[PDB]
């Protein structure tokens, strides 16, 4: 299935090649709707991600749903960061579990095409 093992290797294979100026120029439809400068700090944030996924025991990665308050104190202490950042990293991983299970069920073309860019009313940004 999809774990923080494959997420570990996803983000450590993606911390080699990952950049925000090379990947905000490889899509013309998503850099015109949401702002082109909301991309990322790739080295900071992917070395953060790899740090936080190094702070985990291996069945905490292969079974991400058993991570609770004490586990996040221990992870946030391990790499020298805030419990909230580990919260939002397990958030990001949750979204990617959503997306790759959706890519598992739906054929690659019907889950990459039905992908939607979204605003709260037709007026720009609000």
């Amino acid at each position: 299935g999809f774990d923080l093992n494959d997420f570990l290797e996803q983000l450590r294979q993606m911390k080699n090649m990952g950049g925000x100026x090379x990947x905000x120029x490889x899509x013309x439809x998503x850099x015109x709707x949401x702002x082109x400068x909301x991309x990322x700090x790739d080295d900071k944030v992917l070395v953060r991600m790899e740090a936080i996924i190094n702070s985990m025991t291996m069945k905490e990665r292969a079974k991400p749903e058993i991570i609770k308050g004490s586990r996040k104190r221990r992870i946030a202490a391990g790499c020298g960061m805030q419990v909230q950042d580990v919260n939002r990293l397990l958030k990001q991983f949750d979204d990617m579990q959503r997306m790759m299970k959706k890519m598992k069920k739906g054929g690659x073309x019907x889950x990459x095409x039905x992908x939607x860019x979204x605003x709260x009313x037709x007026x720009x940004x609000x």
Partner: peptide, 18 residues
């Protein structure tokens, strides 16, 4: 390929606007 471009594109990017 196709699953590496569908990996990386919406990974880097859909981690950006969300």
């Amino acid at each position: 390929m196709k699953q590496s471009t569908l990996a990386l594109l919406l990974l880097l990017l859909l981690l950006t606007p969300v």
